[PDB]
Coordinates of C-alpha atoms in Angstrom, one line a residue:
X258 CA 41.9 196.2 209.3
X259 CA 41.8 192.7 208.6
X260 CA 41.0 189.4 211.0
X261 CA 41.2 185.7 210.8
X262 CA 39.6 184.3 213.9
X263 CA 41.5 186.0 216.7
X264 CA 45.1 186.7 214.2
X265 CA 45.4 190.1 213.4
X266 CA 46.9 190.9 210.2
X267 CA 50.2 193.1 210.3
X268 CA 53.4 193.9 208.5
X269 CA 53.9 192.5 204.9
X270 CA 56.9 189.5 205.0
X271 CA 57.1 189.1 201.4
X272 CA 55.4 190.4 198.0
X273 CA 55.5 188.1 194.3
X274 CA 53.8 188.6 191.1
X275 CA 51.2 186.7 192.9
X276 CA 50.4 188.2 195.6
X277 CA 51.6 188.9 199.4
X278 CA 52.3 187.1 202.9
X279 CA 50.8 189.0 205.9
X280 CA 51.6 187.9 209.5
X281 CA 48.7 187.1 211.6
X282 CA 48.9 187.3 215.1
X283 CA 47.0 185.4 217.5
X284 CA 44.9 188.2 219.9
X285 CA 45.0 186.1 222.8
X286 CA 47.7 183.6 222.8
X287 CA 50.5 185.4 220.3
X288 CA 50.6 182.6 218.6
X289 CA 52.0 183.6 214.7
X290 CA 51.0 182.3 211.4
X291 CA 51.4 183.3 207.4
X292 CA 49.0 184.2 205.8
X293 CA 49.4 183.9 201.9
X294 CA 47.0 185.9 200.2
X295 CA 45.9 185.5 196.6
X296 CA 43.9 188.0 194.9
X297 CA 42.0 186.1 192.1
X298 CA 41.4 189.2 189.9
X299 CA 45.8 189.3 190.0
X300 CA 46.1 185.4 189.1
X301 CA 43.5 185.4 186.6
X302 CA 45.3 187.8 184.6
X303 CA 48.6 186.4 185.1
X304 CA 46.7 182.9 183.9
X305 CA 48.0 180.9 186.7
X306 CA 44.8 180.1 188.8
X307 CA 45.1 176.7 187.7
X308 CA 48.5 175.8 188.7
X309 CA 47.9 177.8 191.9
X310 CA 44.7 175.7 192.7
X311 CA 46.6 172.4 191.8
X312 CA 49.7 173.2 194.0
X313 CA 47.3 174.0 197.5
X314 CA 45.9 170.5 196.8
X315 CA 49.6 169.3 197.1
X316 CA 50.2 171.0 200.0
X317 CA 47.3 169.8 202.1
X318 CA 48.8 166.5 201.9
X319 CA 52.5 167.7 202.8
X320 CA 54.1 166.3 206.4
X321 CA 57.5 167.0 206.0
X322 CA 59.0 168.9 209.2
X323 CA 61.7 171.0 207.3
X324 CA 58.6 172.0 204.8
X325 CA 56.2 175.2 205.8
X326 CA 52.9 173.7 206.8
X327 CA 49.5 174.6 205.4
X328 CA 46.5 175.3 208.2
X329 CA 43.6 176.1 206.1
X330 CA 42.1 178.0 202.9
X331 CA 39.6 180.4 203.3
X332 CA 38.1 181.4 199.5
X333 CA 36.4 184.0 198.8
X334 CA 34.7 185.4 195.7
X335 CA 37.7 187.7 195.5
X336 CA 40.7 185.5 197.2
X337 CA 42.1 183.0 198.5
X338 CA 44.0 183.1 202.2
X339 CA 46.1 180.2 202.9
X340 CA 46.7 180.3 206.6
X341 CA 50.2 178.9 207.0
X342 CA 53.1 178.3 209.1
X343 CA 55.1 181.1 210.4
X344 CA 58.8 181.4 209.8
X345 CA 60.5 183.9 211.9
X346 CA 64.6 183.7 210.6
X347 CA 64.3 185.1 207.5
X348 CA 66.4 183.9 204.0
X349 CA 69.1 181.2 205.0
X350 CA 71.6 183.1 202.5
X351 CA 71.1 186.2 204.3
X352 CA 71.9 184.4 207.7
X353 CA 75.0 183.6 206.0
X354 CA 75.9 187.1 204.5
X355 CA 75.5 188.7 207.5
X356 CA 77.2 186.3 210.2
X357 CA 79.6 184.6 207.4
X358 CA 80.3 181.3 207.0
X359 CA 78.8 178.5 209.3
X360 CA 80.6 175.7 211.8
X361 CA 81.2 172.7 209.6
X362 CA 78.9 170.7 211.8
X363 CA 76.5 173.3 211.7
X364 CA 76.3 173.2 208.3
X365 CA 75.9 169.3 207.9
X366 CA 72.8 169.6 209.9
X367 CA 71.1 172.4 207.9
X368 CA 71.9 170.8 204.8
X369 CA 70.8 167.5 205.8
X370 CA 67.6 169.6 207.0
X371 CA 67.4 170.7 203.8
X372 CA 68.4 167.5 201.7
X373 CA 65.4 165.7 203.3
X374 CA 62.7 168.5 202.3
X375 CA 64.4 168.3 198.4
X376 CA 63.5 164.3 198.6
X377 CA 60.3 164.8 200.1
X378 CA 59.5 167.3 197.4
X379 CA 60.9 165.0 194.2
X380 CA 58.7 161.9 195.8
X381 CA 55.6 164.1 196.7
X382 CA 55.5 167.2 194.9
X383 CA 53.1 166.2 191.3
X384 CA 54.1 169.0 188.9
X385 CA 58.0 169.9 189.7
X386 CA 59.1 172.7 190.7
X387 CA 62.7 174.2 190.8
X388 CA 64.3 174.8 194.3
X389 CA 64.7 178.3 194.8
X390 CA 67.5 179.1 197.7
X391 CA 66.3 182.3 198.4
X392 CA 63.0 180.0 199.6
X393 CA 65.3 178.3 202.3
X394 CA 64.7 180.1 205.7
X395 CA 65.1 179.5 209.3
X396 CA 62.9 179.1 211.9
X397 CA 62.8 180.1 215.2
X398 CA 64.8 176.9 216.2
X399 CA 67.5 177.0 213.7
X400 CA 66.0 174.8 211.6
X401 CA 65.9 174.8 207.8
X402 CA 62.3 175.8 206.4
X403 CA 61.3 175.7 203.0
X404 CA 58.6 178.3 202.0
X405 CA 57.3 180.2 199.0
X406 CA 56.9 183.6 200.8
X407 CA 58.4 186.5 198.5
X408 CA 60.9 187.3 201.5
X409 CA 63.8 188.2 198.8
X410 CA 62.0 190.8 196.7
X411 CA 61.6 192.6 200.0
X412 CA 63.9 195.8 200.2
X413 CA 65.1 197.2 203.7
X414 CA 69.2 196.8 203.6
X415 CA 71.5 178.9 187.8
X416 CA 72.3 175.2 186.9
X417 CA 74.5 174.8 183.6
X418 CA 71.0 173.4 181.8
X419 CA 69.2 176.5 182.9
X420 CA 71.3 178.5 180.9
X421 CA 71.9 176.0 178.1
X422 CA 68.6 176.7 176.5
X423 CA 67.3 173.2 176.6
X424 CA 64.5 171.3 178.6
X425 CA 65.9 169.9 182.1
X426 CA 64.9 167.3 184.4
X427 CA 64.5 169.3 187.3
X428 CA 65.6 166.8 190.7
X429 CA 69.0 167.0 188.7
X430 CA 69.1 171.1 188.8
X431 CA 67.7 170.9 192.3
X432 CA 71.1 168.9 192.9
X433 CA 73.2 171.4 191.6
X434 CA 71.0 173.9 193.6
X435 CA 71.8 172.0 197.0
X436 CA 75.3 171.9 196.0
X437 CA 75.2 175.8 195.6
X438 CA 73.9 175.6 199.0
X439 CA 76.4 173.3 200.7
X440 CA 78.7 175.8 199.4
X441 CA 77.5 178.7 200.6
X442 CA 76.6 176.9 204.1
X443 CA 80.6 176.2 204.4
X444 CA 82.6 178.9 202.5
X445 CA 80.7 181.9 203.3
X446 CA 80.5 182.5 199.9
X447 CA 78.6 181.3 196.2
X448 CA 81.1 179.0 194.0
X449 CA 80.4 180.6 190.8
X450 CA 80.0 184.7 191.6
X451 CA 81.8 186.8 189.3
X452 CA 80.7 190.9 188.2
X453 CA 81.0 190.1 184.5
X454 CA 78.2 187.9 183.8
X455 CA 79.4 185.9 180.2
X456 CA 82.9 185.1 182.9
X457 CA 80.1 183.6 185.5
X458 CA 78.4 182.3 182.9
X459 CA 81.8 180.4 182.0
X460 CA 82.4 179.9 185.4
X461 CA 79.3 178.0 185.9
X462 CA 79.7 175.5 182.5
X463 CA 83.7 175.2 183.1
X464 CA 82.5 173.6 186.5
X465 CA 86.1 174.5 188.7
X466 CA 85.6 176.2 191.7
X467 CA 87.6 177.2 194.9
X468 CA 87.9 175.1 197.9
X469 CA 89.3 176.7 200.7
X470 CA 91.7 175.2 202.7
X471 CA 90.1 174.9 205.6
X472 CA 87.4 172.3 204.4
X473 CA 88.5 168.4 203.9
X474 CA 88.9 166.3 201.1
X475 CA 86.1 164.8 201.9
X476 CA 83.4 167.3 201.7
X477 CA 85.3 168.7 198.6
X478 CA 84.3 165.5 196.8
X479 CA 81.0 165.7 197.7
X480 CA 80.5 169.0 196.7
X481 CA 82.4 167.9 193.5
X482 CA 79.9 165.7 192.7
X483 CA 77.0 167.6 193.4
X484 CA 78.4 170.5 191.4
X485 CA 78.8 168.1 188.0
X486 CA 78.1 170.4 185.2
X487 CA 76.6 167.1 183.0
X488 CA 73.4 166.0 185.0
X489 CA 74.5 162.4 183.8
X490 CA 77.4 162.7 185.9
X491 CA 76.2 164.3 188.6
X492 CA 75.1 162.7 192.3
X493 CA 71.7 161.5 193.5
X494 CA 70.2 162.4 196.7
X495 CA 70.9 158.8 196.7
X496 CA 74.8 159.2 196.4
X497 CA 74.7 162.4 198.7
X498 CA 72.8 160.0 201.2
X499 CA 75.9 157.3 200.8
X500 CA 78.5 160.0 201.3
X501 CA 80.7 159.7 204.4
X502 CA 80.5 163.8 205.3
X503 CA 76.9 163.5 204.7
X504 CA 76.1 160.6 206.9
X505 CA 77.8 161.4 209.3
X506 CA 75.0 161.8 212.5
X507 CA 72.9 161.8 210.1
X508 CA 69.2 161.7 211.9
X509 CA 67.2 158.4 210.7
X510 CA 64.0 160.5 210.9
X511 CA 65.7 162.5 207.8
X512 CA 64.8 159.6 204.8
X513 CA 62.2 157.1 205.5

């Protein structure tokens, strides 16, 4: 039975090759965090200790409020326990395959949300690291919250250059990714989903996709652009930014 101060370590939230995410739970207060922990003995022999190491140091210095937070790191001689934010909404995409598609305006904020954390990321982040959606969540306030937790290989109930074989720049497939996103956020559905994998395969470098009726010209361009399937043609946050769906109430808080 395991204690950080006063949390109390309970269920597992999510499991990866590196390790797991407990949630701790304040004795006294119920206050909740996550609690990554690392078991050097595991990392070591996947050789990643290195990149681990250097990714907390990036963390520390991450204030981004649509990015999970970092409290402390405890080391030991056989872990590390990064004491982090808690999340309590689970996967955005699994939001959005059980309760279906969202409100358009709905959807402009949580992709904004999201937007901002991508930008925060490409200007702050050292060593790049591909945008994952299943690492989108939600938290308690309906707020989009990026976090590395291994919720999706929990069981209860790819950008045309990733598959191309080549090198990428990855802000460009993190574009792509967000437009993935949008997509999903507003058709209740992925763009490029097909059973036979060489058709979705051909389906993702073909670059046509559906848009229903019930969405605007406007946001079809957008998406459009974000989906590009040459990373020379395809939008900036920069353009996304400039966009008349994606401005619209757009919070000034969002890019500084």
């Amino acid at each position: 039975r395991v204690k950080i101060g006063h949390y109390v370590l309970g269920d597992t939230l999510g499991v990866g090759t590196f390790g797991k995410v407990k949630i701790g739970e304040h004795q006294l207060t119920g206050h909740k965090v996550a609690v990554k922990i690392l078991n050097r003995q595991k990392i070591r022999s996947l050789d990643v200790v290195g990149k681990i190491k250097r990714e907390i140091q990036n963390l520390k210095l991450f204030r981004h409020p649509h990015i999970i937070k970092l409290y402390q790191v405890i080391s030991t001689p056989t872990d590390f326990f990064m004491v982090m934010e808690y999340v309590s909404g689970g996967e955005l995409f699994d939001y959005i395959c059980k309760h279906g598609r969202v409100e358009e305006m709905e959807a402009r904020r949580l992709f904004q949300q999201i937007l901002s954390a991508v930008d925060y990321c490409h200007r702050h982040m050292v060593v790049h690291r591909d945008l994952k959606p299943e690492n989108v969540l939600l938290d308690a306030h309906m707020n989009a919250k990026i976090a590395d937790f291994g919720l999706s290989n929990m069981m209860s109930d790819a950008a045309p250059e990733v598959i191309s074989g080549r090198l990428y720049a990855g802000p460009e497939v993190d574009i792509w990714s967000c437009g993935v996103i949008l997509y999903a956020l507003l058709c209740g559905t992925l763009p490029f989903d097909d059973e036979h994998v060489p058709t979705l395969f051909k389906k993702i470098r073909g670059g046509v996709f559906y848009i229903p009726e019930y969405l605007n010209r406007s946001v079809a361009t957008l998406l459009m652009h974000m989906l590009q399937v040459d990373p020379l043609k395809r939008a900036t946050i920069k353009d996304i930014r400039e966009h008349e769906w994606f401005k619209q109430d757009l919070p000034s808080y969002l890019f500084p």
